[PDB]
Amino acid sequence: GSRGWGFEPGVRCLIWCD
């Protein structure tokens, strides 16, 4: 994703991130 941080290439908490 692209908005906030977390998972997915692009670093966006999309699916149950760390």
How far CA 4 is from CA of 9, 15, 16, in Å, comes to 12, 13, 13
Q: Are 14 and 6 in contact (CB under 8 A)?
A: yes
Identify the experimental approach.
NMR
Distance between alpha carbon 3 and the CA centroid of its chain, in Å? 8
CA pair distance 1, 17, nearest whole angstrom: 12
Q: Are 10 and 3 in contact (CB under 8 A)?
A: no
